[PDB]
Design a protein around this ligand. Structure first.
Ligand code: HEM
Ligand code: HEM
Ligand SMILES: OC[C@H]1O[C@@](CO)(O[C@H]2O[C@H](CO)[C@@H](O)[C@H](O)[C@H]2O)[C@@H](O)[C@@H]1O
Lengths: 108, 74, 57, 99, 50
């Protein structure tokens, strides 16, 4: 229950500057360095068709929700060791809460 | 503790010279924003950009922040 | 280089090769130590030795 | 190289062992590049999909995005990990790698 | 050559290793390695360093 709803506006800026380089959010969006994230919540990790994930990501088999997403974004390689995702991590809970809030709205 | 270079850059954007330069860039930006709204903008081959104005601004900021930044760092 | 000072050691003769070579050996040692001490002191705090000491915790 | 490019939309991140000596500007250029990404490119500049604007890079269009952000690293010695501090420290490390 | 094509001139920062009598700041090198490992290493190799 750690995830708290925040500003979707601030989350969009975080996605633009921190995730947009490797990810897309629109439905039917193309894959880049990372797989398209539409429909990520409520779905298990490493299942987007057309993208080649690492065995570490697939074997993780995480059913994505707001809370484990928060822990993942804090330190990706610590949560899913052996993953291709190269991210710095959001140490501040406010950043995570805002980013996830935007992500929830982006795929509704 | 916010970024020391960001602080210094913000400070110098506020000097008289810094404000004149941001003004010149902002004026170019507005002019470009208008050109884009015009019909058949995609077909011009002589589209103006504001790189030069942005460069003048950045060069001025660099000239002021470069010799001061490291005294603020570890 | 005072005439009297030079004469006390060399009496109007030029310095001979053997003494030049011997003097070069001593110079090499003293000069290196002198330069090294000055150089390390001028950069005190930046050297690994100084940083390794700082990491006491 | 194939794997490298596949992980960076076709671009190849160069080895950094000699980057400081392999670029005009040396430490100044490396530092200015890492701390020189504006939030948006100057007006009228069409940035090729997948590119990032940085005035210090010839042509302004670079395949590397800004990667340094405040506090992304926790310095062992207590030093505040600001963007400029990290850029200064990594550039110094890279200068040592090269020389 | 236009300004854009050439790239903005990088200004002169006061690196503590600038100057004939100056060594590198080894604490800065140490910290810089950490930045390389945690950030740069994901995309950048350092092949010539043993
Ligand atoms: C905070 C910004 C980011 C968010 C919210 C984010 C989110 C995600 C999520 C939730 C996944 C899991 C995908 C799945 O299981 O279907 C993922 C995978 C991935 N992401 Fe990101 N990401 C971000 C930034 C980045 C960046 C900057 C890059 C590129 C340098 C990147 C590269 C990847 C890759 C390569 C994968 C695949 C992992 C694997 O197969 O091991 N991501 N990302
Ligand atoms: C603070 C850590 C990093 C440092 C010090 C660094 C440094 C550099 C430098 C100096 C260049 C050369 C630019 C030139 O040609 O003048 C470069 C290019 C590049 N970097 Fe990085 N980088 C870092 C992290 C990253 C990360 C994490 C990635 C992958 C997500 C990345 C991807 C690239 C790419 C794709 C290029 C090629 C750019 C181009 O030629 O258009 N870099 N980097
Ligand atoms: O490939 C990166 C991708 O990010 C975007 C997001 O809008 O570019 C923005 O963020 C970059 C990261 O620093 C900036 O360099 C760029 O100027 C900014 O527009 C995409 O435009 C770009 O393809």
């Amino acid at each position: 229950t750690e995830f708290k709803a925040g500003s979707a506006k601030k989350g969009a800026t975080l996605f633009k500057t921190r995730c947009l380089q490797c990810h897309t959010v629109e439905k039917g969006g193309p894959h880049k360095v990372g797989p398209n994230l539409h429909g990520i919540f409520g779905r298990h990790s490493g299942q987007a068709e057309g993208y080649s994930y690492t065995d570490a990501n697939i074997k993780k088999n995480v059913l994505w929700d707001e809370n484990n997403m928060s822990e993942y974004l804090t330190n990706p390689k610590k949560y899913i060791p052996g993953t291709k995702m190269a991210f710095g991590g959001l140490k501040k809970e406010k950043d995570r809460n805002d980013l996830i809030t935007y992500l929830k709205k982006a795929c509704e | 503790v916010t970024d020391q270079l960001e602080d210094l850059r913000e400070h110098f954007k506020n000097t008289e010279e810094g404000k004149a330069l941001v003004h010149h860039y902002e004026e170019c930006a507005e002019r470009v924003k208008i050109q884009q709204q015009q019909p058949g903008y995609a077909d011009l081959e002589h589209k103006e950009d504001c790189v030069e104005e942005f460069f003048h601004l950045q060069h001025y900021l660099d000239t002021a922040t470069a010799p001061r930044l490291f005294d603020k760092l570890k | 280089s005072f005439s009297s000072l030079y004469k006390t050691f060399f009496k109007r003769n030029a310095v001979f090769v053997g003494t030049i070579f011997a003097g070069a050996f001593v110079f090499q040692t003293v000069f290196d130590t002198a330069i090294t001490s000055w150089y390390e002191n001028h950069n005190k705090g930046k050297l690994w030795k100084d940083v390794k000491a700082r990491i006491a915790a | 190289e194939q794997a490298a490019r596949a992980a960076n939309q076709g671009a190849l991140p160069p080895d950094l062992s000699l980057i400081v000596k392999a670029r005009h500007g040396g430490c100044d250029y490396i530092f200015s590049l890492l701390t020189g990404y504006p939030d948006e490119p100057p007006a009228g500049v069409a940035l090729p999909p997948g590119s990032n604007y940085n005035p210090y890079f010839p042509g302004g269009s670079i395949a590397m995005a800004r990667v340094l952000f405040d506090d992304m690293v926790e310095y062992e010695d207590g030093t505040p990990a600001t963007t400029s501090q990290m850029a200064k420290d990594v550039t110094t490390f890279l200068n040592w790698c090269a020389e | 050559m236009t300004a854009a094509e050439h790239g903005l001139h990088a200004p002169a920062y006061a690196w503590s290793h600038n100057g004939p009598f100056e060594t590198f700041d080894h604490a800065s090198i140490r910290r810089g390695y950490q930045v390389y490992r945690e950030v740069c290493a994901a995309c950048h190799s350092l092949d010539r360093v043993a």
